[PDB]
Amino acid sequence: PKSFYDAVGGAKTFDAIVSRFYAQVAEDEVLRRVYPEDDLAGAEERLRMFLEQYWGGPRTYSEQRGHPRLRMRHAPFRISLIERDAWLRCMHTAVASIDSETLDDEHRRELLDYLEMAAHSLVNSPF
Amino acid sequence: KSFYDAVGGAKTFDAIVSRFYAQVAEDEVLRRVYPEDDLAGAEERLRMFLEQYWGGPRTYSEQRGHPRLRMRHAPFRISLIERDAWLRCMHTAVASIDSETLDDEHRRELLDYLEMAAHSLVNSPF
Amino acid sequence: PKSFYDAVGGAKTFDAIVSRFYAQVAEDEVLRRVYPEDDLAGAEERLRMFLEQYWGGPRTYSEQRGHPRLRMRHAPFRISLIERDAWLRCMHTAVASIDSETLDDEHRRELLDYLEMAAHSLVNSPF
Amino acid sequence: KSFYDAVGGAKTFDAIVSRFYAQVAEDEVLRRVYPEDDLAGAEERLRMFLEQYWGGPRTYSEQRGHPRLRMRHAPFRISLIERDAWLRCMHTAVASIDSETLDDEHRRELLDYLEMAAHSLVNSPF
Amino acid sequence: PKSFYDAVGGAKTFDAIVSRFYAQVAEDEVLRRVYPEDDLAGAEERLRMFLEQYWGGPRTYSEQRGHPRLRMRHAPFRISLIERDAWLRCMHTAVASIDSETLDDEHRRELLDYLEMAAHSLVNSPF
Amino acid sequence: PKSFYDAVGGAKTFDAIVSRFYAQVAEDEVLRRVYPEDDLAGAEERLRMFLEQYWGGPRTYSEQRGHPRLRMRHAPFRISLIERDAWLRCMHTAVASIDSETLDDEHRRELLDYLEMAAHSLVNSPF
Amino acid sequence: PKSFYDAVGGAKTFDAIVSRFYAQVAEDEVLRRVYPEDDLAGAEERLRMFLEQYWGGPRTYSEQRGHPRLRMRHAPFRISLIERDAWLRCMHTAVASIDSETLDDEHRRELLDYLEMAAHSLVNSPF
Amino acid sequence: PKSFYDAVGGAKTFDAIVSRFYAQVAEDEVLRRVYPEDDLAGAEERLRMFLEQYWGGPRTYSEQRGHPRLRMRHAPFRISLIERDAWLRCMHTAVASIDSETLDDEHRRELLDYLEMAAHSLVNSPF
Amino acid sequence: KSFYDAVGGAKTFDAIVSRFYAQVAEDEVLRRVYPEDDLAGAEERLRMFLEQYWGGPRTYSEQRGHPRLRMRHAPFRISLIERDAWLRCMHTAVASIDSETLDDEHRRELLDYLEMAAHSLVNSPF
Amino acid sequence: KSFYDAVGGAKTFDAIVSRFYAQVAEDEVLRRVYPEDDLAGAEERLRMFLEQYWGGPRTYSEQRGHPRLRMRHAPFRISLIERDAWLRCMHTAVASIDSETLDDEHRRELLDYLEMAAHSLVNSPF
Amino acid sequence: PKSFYDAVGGAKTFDAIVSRFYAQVAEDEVLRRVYPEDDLAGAEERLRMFLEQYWGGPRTYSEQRGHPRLRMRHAPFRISLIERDAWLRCMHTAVASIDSETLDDEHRRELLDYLEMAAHSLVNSPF
Amino acid sequence: PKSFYDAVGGAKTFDAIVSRFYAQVAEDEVLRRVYPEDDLAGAEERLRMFLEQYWGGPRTYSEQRGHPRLRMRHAPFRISLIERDAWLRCMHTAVASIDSETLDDEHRRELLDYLEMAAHSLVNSPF
């Protein structure tokens, strides 16, 4: 279709990204100890639902979670440039794992531009 | 041989669920409850769920994860009235399938399942 | 202008109501099992913040928790008429413990009418 | 006026549940699922629950604690067959109450609840 | 004659089936959400012990856990055809991983017949 | 037949005993440290159900929990004479709180003889 | 005499400071974008209660608001260096309006050192 | 009585102080949110053991816990003047509950002086 | 009647444990493991524990809390050697009590208990 | 170098444990506590544990998992009577092993251990 | 270069040993049941920290945790010869994975000699 | 280049800054009392790695040190306003030792703003 979500391959693509992302998080010395060790599956699910929604996919995230209120969702954690950069490192790996046939050069840039902006907007701590 | 295969698999479930969701679209009661405009996503997810439920492809759980139907319906006020409207549309959809595709035994099992599941999802007094 | 909140004695009144409500809950065969055993302090605080906001007091609740989304916040719990009635019993006890000088008949009635309707609107289970 | 008082309260619920459980005793399907002999305790617990549910005395939760119906039914295999037999018996018991006592709207409300609750408690394929 | 347990290679075989089953579970989007994430080792062991006993091996299971009472042990979980099918998928691959020298065609048949019947018997939910 | 259960006032009596016992348990320097502190309500309920069943009341305990297997259910805890004595002190207080019209002298003596014997039977540790 | 609160003039002084502070906030281009849009009366009350309690005066703050969680209560708002500085300007203005007889050199310096450290510590945003 | 501990009545006195102190904590708006709600028995016990040891009594505290290292022990907690003042308020109440024959004016003063100083030494946060 | 009362109550326990801890002070193996000087506190706590264990006053748990003997012995290296020295001191202390106070059956019961308890507290290979 | 190898390894532990469990089968006290008939699995598991404990093969943990002996003995009432019967039978078994295979130092070390462990496993006043 | 820590490659080497140790622990049937499943990252971190300090590197361990007090750290666990042997197997594998260029034959002997003596010193249980 | 780290000269710049910083600490009357007593070599290395990572350089800090827990890591040390100011003096001196060609006015301002905020936020002591 027309939606960014469908253009990039819909649910299959977002599951692939968020899934490979959280696998990176597991091996990430920084983020390993940020994400609640006991709730890894649920965390992945919420991030996927959110990104699906954001890019014009299902609006399930909002029905389940409310307005994103990301600032307040991340308030429990001390996110400095170090966490921001680790998150982006993991996400860049995840996104780079998607072939160019599925994910355009134009769609890739748009996505990465958003992620880069969003991650910085959520920094809430000097260390 | 799975139920899914026995009843004609993908074509049958697409026929049922597309006919069901075409009805929802024109149903006063249900239009009020389903998200406001394009029911394309709702149709896809329902179809995928039923296909996996009856032994077909596992693409529902692949795309939506472990089923948590009560929680997924929780945002919506499903009273007896919505339940009955849903069941009417679904009975209509199933009735559109011929006896050669969906034999009497499989028809009864499918309908028995859907009625009880629909009752089990009622989550609101109004 | 005079707010319902100030008219009824503000923070002090709402703290009396909610604390006494939560003390009744602990004593209630139905409800003591519903409220998470390990988070009664926070639970009490969130209800208090919500009610203070609803009735014209501080708007901290919305800042901290977003839109009330009460249906989704109660979704984790099977609330039938039995839990609704037990909730109203406890709340009625709590409200009755406020004197009439503080909470006059008119404001008492308005409060109780709201709580009755709100409790009825949160029923989400047959049993 | 609670629903409980409107329909005649304890007198009515004892009449409904007495007549219900008298049928259970002779229903081969249900006789097999209920504990093997004296159905007095099962009758008393179902009656107490219904009385509390509809706004009467709190004896049920005082004696039984917070309602946990799915878990309390979990030891028993309640398939569609048991559900239907339970419902048949309940309808038959409710039909014994006159219209002066249980008017049309209340009768409908009660039956609607019981049908929905029974579907919601099915917990076995056979 | 020989026990079923000894005939198929006893503890080593049952350990292999159940550990491979449990690794499949972790990679199963349906089932990884159903098994308590904090208790996977203990859950594996209990299944292992049950199976060893059922097939004529050590009766430690009964000593430690009492009668199987599998219906009540599974009551805490909503097991529909979806979870039943996912369980059978994971178990089928685990069993398939045992070679024919260890696990006869006749024995393999008998084991699988039982697991398929038992998994179906434990469905307790419409969804 | 007349059950001991009915003779001593049935569900109401057993609820009063077990509820008062557990309130003693909370003020007990020995026992408050033995009972998992996040599970006191479920603990109270299971003991109530067992005691109702033992004395000829509802057989719900057996349905929900199987055979009592009290030895194996207390195996997780180090029960020495110190814990036995503390348990009995609290239970004696709880039983003493029931009036003589509800619980007459001979039923009281029978109930207490059983509890004393049962408490001693669950001793599993030297300290 | 004894407490910092009494030494500096108590309720009188803190009302003078915070009222003058929050009258500054109302006209402040930076801060009016961050404080909740209209009536700053509740904001002033809460800040004043907090400061009064912090310095050893009445415990009204915690009685009405609970245990201080300043980071979380500020988390809804974007407090960058710009807002921190703006807040400190208003506060320095407010403190400078108190004469030396009421707030002597020693207490003035102590107060301002604290406010400086506190404000810096509440920065939670890059922009 | 030659040791401070013995002079003031030993174990009985210290149990009474710390017991009553912890009861005050539970009623304290500031402090009940600071002490982990699932570990109150243990926390009371550790403080008792520490205080017994500090004042010339049993040296069990250091056997069990090592060197006090109170600063590091309190590092997980934001202790500002507000928490310091509330702790001291609860402790003054506890100490005041002991008669003067048991704890005479001279020992009371030494104990209070120490507790005031120690609470101040543990402040680690601006709010 | 409690074991505690049967053996003469406080006087007997004070006699046993005082004589026990007087031995400890001169036992080179035990002197090395008990904290370095005044064993008055250790003696008090052991006595209170044993008095409560055998049905006497609850002073032990009142002052010390719920018993956690393994954790309380954990700071100390109790090998077979320390276990045997402790047992010998206790045997010697118990032998100081006459048969009129501590009859043959209660003596055996006490000794059997101490032996079991002492073995269960060994926590070191050296 | 391993205690297991020093005492003659598999042959020795099979010798000790087989003769031990032969005694068990004929022991009134023990016969009552071990599972009612074929002591074959019990013998196997004890042997494997002792073998692993003393530095031999890891077959025990491979087949049985992390050791949890207290919990594994919990189902059985092991009073001092059962402890003493077990120890007698074990001492008999060990005494059937000659000094050249099990020298005086390894014998004492083995017996010290078995005594301590058996004492630590008493879990019942009767 | 000078300290043992530098001689063997410092932080890099110790991270490799401990990390590889903890991977072996996860596949050890004895030890995976001993280490708290919910705290593996922290466990590895604390062991790394301790070893780094012990061999003359950073003294962060003592700053954060105090004197090692390893007997008391291990008291919560039943460490018999079986656990001792499993630990040493895992650690020997981890150490053996370090090349002889990084870890001298003389430094390897010294490291392993310490580890073998320490593991034995921490045995605290018969089974 | 594009990362802050690269734009300001990367490894060379950070080594120069932190080398010059820690050379001062050694002879600083205030700071020498707070840093571990002798060889400030490890401290310097650790601070450098941290700042390099923080500004988008190598991840060597998290690789060797884990996730930043700066508050906890400074917890052992009494950092009042005096130590804060002494630290900032030494750091401002080190930063001033870098020429404008290497370290932009723009980048210098950003770096200094961060260091001031970070340092203020790490104050953990009244004295």
Ligand code: HEM
């Ligand atoms: C900047 C570094 C970030 C870190 C360290 C981080 C970390 C976390 C953590 C620890 C959680 C809680 C996990 C859970 O329990 O759900 C979370 C939640 C979440 N994050 Fe992030 N995150 C970062 C950035 C982002 C970004 C850039 C996005 C979107 C573009 C995002 C979207 C979400 C969503 C949608 C949730 C779930 C919110 C909910 O509960 O509904 N995060 N994040």
Ligand code: HEM
């Ligand atoms: C009782 C009457 C029912 C009503 C009024 C109802 C209504 C809805 C609505 C409004 C949604 C959200 C649609 C969207 O995504 O925009 C939904 C989702 C869904 N429904 Fe129903 N539904 C009913 C019964 C059922 C039954 C009986 C089933 C299957 C047995 C079912 C299966 C599903 C599934 C699989 C989803 C998607 C869940 C997810 O993956 O997020 N529903 N339903």
Ligand code: HEM
């Ligand atoms: C009908 C019976 C009700 C039951 C059984 C019930 C029970 C609960 C429970 C168990 C929670 C979770 C406690 C927590 O952790 O926060 C909760 C949350 C809450 N409830 Fe209720 N409740 C009922 C009705 C109401 C009503 C009538 C109101 C308002 C008038 C209300 C307002 C709230 C609020 C504001 C929260 C916190 C939501 C948040 O997280 O922000 N509840 N309730």
Ligand code: HEM
């Ligand atoms: C679906 C068909 C049903 C069947 C076959 C069934 C059967 C049973 C059985 C066998 C028991 C245990 C009886 C005993 O104590 O010996 C029971 C308990 C109970 N049932 Fe049902 N039941 C059904 C539906 C319902 C419904 C619809 C309700 C209420 C709306 C209900 C309410 C209860 C209550 C309150 C108990 C006692 C729970 C307790 O306090 O332990 N049942 N049922």
Ligand code: HEM
């Ligand atoms: C139908 C799909 C099934 C699902 C989703 C499922 C899931 C579960 C879960 C979540 C548990 C609790 C894990 C724990 O011990 O903490 C469990 C326990 C257990 N399951 Fe299943 N299971 C299924 C089928 C089966 C089958 C077919 C068998 C036997 C052939 C079985 C045997 C057991 C046993 C023996 C336990 C441990 C009971 C105890 O606590 O003693 N399960 N299962």
Ligand code: HEM
């Ligand atoms: C001798 C001292 C005793 C102690 C220290 C003790 C303690 C405990 C504890 C800690 C639990 C587990 C609570 C939980 O986490 O669920 C428990 C369970 C239970 N206890 Fe006791 N108990 C004692 C004696 C008794 C006696 C004498 C009886 C019967 C007269 C009894 C009956 C039960 C029952 C029925 C359960 C629930 C088992 C289940 O899970 O179904 N206990 N006890």
Ligand code: HEM
């Ligand atoms: C750094 C610059 C600061 C800014 C921009 C700021 C801004 C705000 C805002 C917008 C609110 C919510 C206002 C409302 O209720 O409508 C608030 C609340 C509050 N602030 Fe600040 N603040 C700052 C620093 C401080 C400092 C330094 C303190 C005390 C030392 C402080 C103490 C408080 C308190 C006690 C509350 C009320 C918390 C509650 O009970 O809900 N703030 N602040």
Ligand code: HEM
């Ligand atoms: C200044 C206000 C204080 C606050 C808010 C406070 C709070 C706390 C909290 C929350 C804990 C952890 C509870 C636990 O799990 O053990 C704790 C531990 C402890 N506190 Fe305090 N405390 C304060 C002052 C003091 C003072 C003045 C002393 C000594 C006179 C003290 C002695 C201790 C000891 C010995 C522990 C246990 C350390 C251990 O784990 O061994 N505290 N405190």
Ligand code: HEM
């Ligand atoms: C096995 C040989 C034993 C040795 C070497 C030993 C040694 C010790 C030592 C060194 C202490 C600390 C003394 C102090 O306060 O300075 C202690 C405490 C104690 N011991 Fe033993 N002990 C042994 C066996 C036993 C036995 C068999 C019992 C009781 C049956 C026992 C009961 C106690 C009690 C109640 C305490 C005080 C615990 C507390 O409240 O902190 N001990 N022991």
Ligand code: HEM
């Ligand atoms: C104190 C007297 C003892 C008695 C009466 C006793 C009795 C028993 C019994 C009845 C069983 C279950 C047998 C079966 O599987 O059918 C058992 C299991 C076992 N016993 Fe003992 N035992 C004693 C002491 C010991 C000692 C001292 C050890 C080792 C030092 C030991 C090691 C084991 C082991 C390893 C098992 C198998 C545990 C498992 O893997 O499931 N026992 N014992």
Ligand code: HEM
């Ligand atoms: C003998 C076999 C051993 C076993 C079974 C064992 C097991 C454990 C376990 C389960 C923990 C708790 C993990 C945690 O921190 O959550 C732990 C902690 C620890 N162990 Fe071991 N360990 C053994 C030997 C050793 C040895 C030989 C050393 C030193 C060379 C050591 C050093 C440590 C340290 C430093 C900690 C963390 C202490 C702290 O909390 O600060 N362990 N061990």
Ligand code: HEM
């Ligand atoms: C406020 C004034 C400060 C003082 C007095 C101070 C002092 C110290 C001291 C004494 C240490 C331990 C040194 C050692 O390992 O021997 C340390 C560690 C450290 N500091 Fe600071 N510091 C201050 C501010 C800062 C700031 C602003 C930063 C970064 C923006 C910082 C970053 C670090 C790092 C990364 C460590 C090592 C943490 C670790 O990996 O263990 N410090 N500091």
Ligand SMILES: [C-]#N
């Ligand atoms: C549902 N649709």
Ligand SMILES: [C-]#N
């Ligand atoms: C159900 N009766």
Ligand SMILES: [C-]#N
């Ligand atoms: C903040 N005011």
Ligand SMILES: [C-]#N
């Ligand atoms: C212990 N003495």
